[PDB]
Motif scaffolding. Structure first.
Motif, PDB file in Angstrom:
ATOM      1  N   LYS A  70       0.819  -1.137  -0.089  1.00  0.00           N
ATOM      2  CA  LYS A  70      -0.121  -0.011  -0.147  1.00  0.00           C
ATOM      3  C   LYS A  70       0.758   1.663  -0.197  1.00  0.00           C
ATOM      4  N   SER A  71       0.267   2.230  -0.839  1.00  0.00           N
ATOM      5  CA  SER A  71       0.855   3.947  -0.618  1.00  0.00           C
ATOM      6  C   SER A  71      -0.335   4.593  -0.550  1.00  0.00           C
ATOM      7  N   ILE A  72       0.504   5.889  -0.363  1.00  0.00           N
ATOM      8  CA  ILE A  72      -0.611   6.959  -0.374  1.00  0.00           C
ATOM      9  C   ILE A  72      -0.495   7.856  -0.948  1.00  0.00           C
ATOM     10  N   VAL A  73      -1.320   8.572  -1.116  1.00  0.00           N
ATOM     11  CA  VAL A  73      -1.850   9.679  -2.674  1.00  0.00           C
ATOM     12  C   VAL A  73      -2.220  11.157  -2.044  1.00  0.00           C
ATOM     13  N   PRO A  74      -1.671  11.750  -2.283  1.00  0.00           N
ATOM     14  CA  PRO A  74      -1.734  12.814  -1.999  1.00  0.00           C
ATOM     15  C   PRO A  74      -3.219  13.451  -2.535  1.00  0.00           C
ATOM     16  N   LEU A 108     -10.224   1.814  -8.585  1.00  0.00           N
ATOM     17  CA  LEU A 108      -9.000   2.141  -9.124  1.00  0.00           C
ATOM     18  C   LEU A 108      -7.283   1.942  -8.559  1.00  0.00           C
ATOM     19  N   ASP A 109      -7.294   2.011  -7.236  1.00  0.00           N
ATOM     20  CA  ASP A 109      -6.563   1.771  -7.370  1.00  0.00           C
ATOM     21  C   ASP A 109      -5.676  -0.212  -7.269  1.00  0.00           C
ATOM     22  N   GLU A 110      -6.768  -0.948  -6.772  1.00  0.00           N
ATOM     23  CA  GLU A 110      -6.341  -1.784  -7.319  1.00  0.00           C
ATOM     24  C   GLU A 110      -6.624  -2.775  -8.667  1.00  0.00           C
ATOM     25  N   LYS A 112     -11.740   6.078   3.300  1.00  0.00           N
ATOM     26  CA  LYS A 112     -11.727   7.302   5.187  1.00  0.00           C
ATOM     27  C   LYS A 112     -10.804   6.760   5.675  1.00  0.00           C
ATOM     28  N   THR A 113     -10.592   5.403   6.007  1.00  0.00           N
ATOM     29  CA  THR A 113      -9.381   5.027   6.809  1.00  0.00           C
ATOM     30  C   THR A 113      -8.453   5.034   6.506  1.00  0.00           C
ATOM     31  N   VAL A 114      -7.566   5.371   5.211  1.00  0.00           N
ATOM     32  CA  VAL A 114      -6.348   5.824   5.211  1.00  0.00           C
ATOM     33  C   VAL A 114      -6.438   7.515   5.155  1.00  0.00           C
ATOM     34  N   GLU A 153     -18.993   6.152   1.040  1.00  0.00           N
ATOM     35  CA  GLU A 153     -18.999   4.746   1.096  1.00  0.00           C
ATOM     36  C   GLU A 153     -18.556   3.568   1.049  1.00  0.00           C
ATOM     37  N   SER A 154     -18.425   2.598   0.864  1.00  0.00           N
ATOM     38  CA  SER A 154     -17.093   1.293   2.134  1.00  0.00           C
ATOM     39  C   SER A 154     -15.362   1.683   1.451  1.00  0.00           C
ATOM     40  N   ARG A 155     -15.968   2.544   0.020  1.00  0.00           N
ATOM     41  CA  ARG A 155     -14.116   2.243  -0.478  1.00  0.00           C
ATOM     42  C   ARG A 155     -13.917   3.611  -1.006  1.00  0.00           C
ATOM     43  N   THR A 156     -14.496   4.671  -0.370  1.00  0.00           N
ATOM     44  CA  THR A 156     -13.766   5.772  -0.774  1.00  0.00           C
ATOM     45  C   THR A 156     -12.271   5.936   0.293  1.00  0.00           C
TER      46      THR A 156
HETATM   47  N1  ATP Z   1      -4.212   8.128  -0.558  1.00  0.00           N
HETATM   48  C1  ATP Z   1      -4.332   6.888  -0.868  1.00  0.00           C
HETATM   49  N2  ATP Z   1      -3.512   6.664  -1.514  1.00  0.00           N
HETATM   50  C2  ATP Z   1      -3.425   4.898  -2.335  1.00  0.00           C
HETATM   51  N3  ATP Z   1      -3.989   4.678  -2.228  1.00  0.00           N
HETATM   52  C3  ATP Z   1      -5.431   4.681  -0.679  1.00  0.00           C
HETATM   53  C4  ATP Z   1      -5.233   6.158  -0.608  1.00  0.00           C
HETATM   54  N4  ATP Z   1      -6.219   6.260  -0.018  1.00  0.00           N
HETATM   55  C5  ATP Z   1      -7.263   5.356   0.084  1.00  0.00           C
HETATM   56  N5  ATP Z   1      -6.679   4.007  -1.038  1.00  0.00           N
HETATM   57  C6  ATP Z   1      -6.859   3.629  -1.745  1.00  0.00           C
HETATM   58  O1  ATP Z   1      -7.573   2.130  -1.116  1.00  0.00           O
HETATM   59  C7  ATP Z   1      -7.644   1.519   0.453  1.00  0.00           C
HETATM   60  C8  ATP Z   1      -7.598   1.457   1.659  1.00  0.00           C
HETATM   61  O2  ATP Z   1      -8.217   1.120   2.296  1.00  0.00           O
HETATM   62  P1  ATP Z   1      -9.656   1.032   1.723  1.00  0.00           P
HETATM   63  O3  ATP Z   1      -9.972   2.478   1.404  1.00  0.00           O
HETATM   64  O4  ATP Z   1     -10.174  -0.293   0.341  1.00  0.00           O
HETATM   65  O5  ATP Z   1     -10.584   1.184   3.050  1.00  0.00           O
HETATM   66  P2  ATP Z   1     -11.731   1.887   3.596  1.00  0.00           P
HETATM   67  O6  ATP Z   1     -12.058   2.410   2.424  1.00  0.00           O
HETATM   68  O7  ATP Z   1     -11.125   2.134   4.991  1.00  0.00           O
HETATM   69  O8  ATP Z   1     -12.832   0.948   4.371  1.00  0.00           O
HETATM   70  P3  ATP Z   1     -13.942   0.736   5.546  1.00  0.00           P
HETATM   71  O9  ATP Z   1     -14.146   2.060   4.555  1.00  0.00           O
HETATM   72  O10 ATP Z   1     -14.695  -0.259   4.910  1.00  0.00           O
HETATM   73  O11 ATP Z   1     -14.190   1.017   6.663  1.00  0.00           O
HETATM   74  C9  ATP Z   1      -5.747   1.177  -0.177  1.00  0.00           C
HETATM   75  O12 ATP Z   1      -5.193   0.176  -0.253  1.00  0.00           O
HETATM   76  C10 ATP Z   1      -5.480   2.012  -1.767  1.00  0.00           C
HETATM   77  O13 ATP Z   1      -5.950   0.682  -2.828  1.00  0.00           O
END
Ligand code: ATP
Ligand code: MG
Lengths: 87, 257
Positions: free
Chosen positions: B13-17, B226-228, B48-50, B43-46
């Motif tokens: 995993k990596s974090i994009v600005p 998009l990431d995966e 948020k946690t990151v 929604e679930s794949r936006t």
């Molecule tokens: N800054 C970021 N850089 C890279 N990937 C990101 C970033 N923010 C989100 N992502 C994408 O989202 C993934 C992080 O987990 P994900 O967003 O699928 O879970 P989540 O939305 O926190 O889950 P839930 O909402 O169910 O708690 C990364 O692996 C990547 O695919």
RNA sequence: UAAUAGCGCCGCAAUUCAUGCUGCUUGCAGCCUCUGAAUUUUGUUAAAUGAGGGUUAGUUUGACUGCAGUCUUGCUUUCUGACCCUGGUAGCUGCUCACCCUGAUGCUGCUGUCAAUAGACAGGAUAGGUGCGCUCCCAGCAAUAAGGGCGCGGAUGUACUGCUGUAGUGGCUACUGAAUCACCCCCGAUCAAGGGGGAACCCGGGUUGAAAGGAGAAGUCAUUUAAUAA
């Protein structure tokens, strides 16, 4: 404590036999030999507290062995007192 | 082998600005100084946690001579059917204090005792809806009776739980919503993944009209998909000796959805 | 690897007032900026305590007379600094051990190098466990707290470290290695003795860490080690 040769010498002279490894004659005589070597050091080294513990034990054993022998056989007791120069 | 290194780097995993992460960081910083509790929804794949984890590294613990550490931001994610003990265990352990045996009142006192003294300003809670309904009395207790902004994070299901209690809904009424990507924003983002995340030996032109039809249907604007999708295509392509993604391996990956 | 716990200290954080801080009502109101009491919390390149053994007739705590001028002695102790060592062979002597199990206010525990034998060599008070220590805890040993098991010989009228033994660990005496200092350096005296030469700073003179004292004799108590005894 005594040299190896000195124990063997004392046990062969106070023991009734060479195999007499621990008769009262032997034990009392050995104690008398130790005490005679310890009074010559303890009269000089008056500060040597750790040796006064050794002397007071070693004299008190001699007395128990002698009291036991006195009742057991007065003839053995009398001869032993003579041979060790005690009073 | 070089391919080995790329395959082992593309799974990680990596974090994009993104502008949605920037927006949250500033919004939380308002709430932190203001000490007002609120929630983050979407929604679930936006992602948020990151965005929150990324915010925790804006606020590492602070220290000076004569002072214990301030720990300005705390982050936790509860277990399922979290009782008050399980919440207090997770707060205490994030502060790295030893947890002993005790009754719930010993944990509660131990928790107030380390949210004071060790200074905390904000508590961020992923997956808030794992909390058992009674524990919210303990969340409210923390927020009113200590100078702490509590930040609940979760999906549209969280609000379905919160609506079941006026007392909570009102403490946490203010909110920010994460959304999905579209139009120019989705197109501009694909160029960031191409050039920051993938870093393949030659350009794949992923922002081109032919490629953006494939990505738009495959991803529906979720940054997660998009990431995966893009990593899975980059990985597969590299194994075939390709120095880029191509339309056919990208469609092979998209067709699994 | 391990040392989680318990107990005693040390601050750190509050919370509660006062023996404190603003007023005048000289006793109330008000708070914790200090200085302090009480409780509770903590173990955060927080802060504060922090016992490996030794070394100076050391400095300051002094007397008298109107804070200035004279005189000044080196006694008995408690700290803070600083420096040195982590010992050498020559006798005397105590205790401990057939061999096992339990393991005690039991011994041992630092860094680096060589051996990887149990020991040398070079560093050193940071020296097993935590903020700091313990009779607590962890690791190794355990014959030298104690209890129990038990082999062959001596004795066997109750006595029997009394056998299975050359090492382990102490004690004492004589000589000897280093520091024999109070800002450093050098030459000396220890029932006496001082003297000579410099560095740094302040405004040719000072400065170059402080503090305490009523002493002797005798009986008695409490714990704590040894010995003897029933
Ligand atoms: N800054 C970021 N850089 C890279 N990937 C990101 C970033 N923010 C989100 N992502 C994408 O989202 C993934 C992080 O987990 P994900 O967003 O699928 O879970 P989540 O939305 O926190 O889950 P839930 O909402 O169910 O708690 C990364 O692996 C990547 O695919
Ligand atoms: Mg989440």
């Amino acid at each position: 404590s005594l040299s190896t040769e000195a124990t063997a010498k004392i046990v062969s002279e106070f023991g009734r036999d060479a195999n007499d490894t621990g008769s009262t004659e032997v034990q009392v005589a050995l104690l008398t030999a130790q005490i005679n070597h310890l009074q010559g050091h303890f009269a000089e080294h008056k500060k040597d507290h750790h040796s006064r513990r050794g002397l007071l034990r070693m004299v008190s054993q001699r007395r128990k062995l002698l009291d036991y022998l006195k009742r057991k056989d007065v003839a053995r007791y009398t001869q032993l007192i003579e041979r060790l120069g005690l009073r | 082998e070089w391919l080995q290194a790329e395959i082992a780097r593309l799974k990680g995993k990596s974090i994009v600005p993104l502008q949605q992460v920037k927006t949250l960081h500033d919004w939380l910083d308002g709430k932190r100084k203001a000490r007002k509790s609120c929630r983050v929804v979407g929604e679930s794949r936006t992602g948020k946690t990151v965005a929150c984890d990324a915010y925790r590294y804006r606020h590492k613990p602070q220290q000076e001579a004569g002072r214990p550490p301030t720990v300005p931001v705390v982050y936790i994610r509860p277990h399922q059917k979290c009782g008050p003990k399980d919440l207090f265990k997770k707060i205490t352990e994030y502060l790295k204090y030893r947890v002993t045996k005790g009754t719930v009142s010993d944990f509660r006192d131990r928790t107030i005792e380390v949210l004071k003294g060790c200074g905390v300003e904000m508590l961020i809670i992923d997956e808030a809806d794992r909390l058992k309904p009674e524990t919210f009395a303990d969340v409210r207790d923390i927020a009113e009776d200590l100078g702490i902004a509590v930040v609940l994070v979760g999906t549209d299901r969280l609000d379905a739980v919160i609506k079941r209690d006026e007392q909570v809904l009102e403490r946490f009424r203010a909110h920010l919503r994460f959304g999905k990507l579209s139009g120019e924003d989705f197109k501009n983002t694909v160029e960031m993944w191409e050039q920051m995340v993938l870093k393949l030996p030659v350009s794949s032109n992923l922002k081109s009209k032919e490629m953006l039809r494939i990505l738009t249907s495959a991803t529906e604007g979720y940054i997660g998909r998009l990431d995966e999708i893009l990593r899975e295509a980059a990985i597969r392509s590299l194994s075939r000796g390709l120095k880029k993604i191509d339309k056919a391996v990208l469609q092979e990956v998209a067709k699994e959805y």
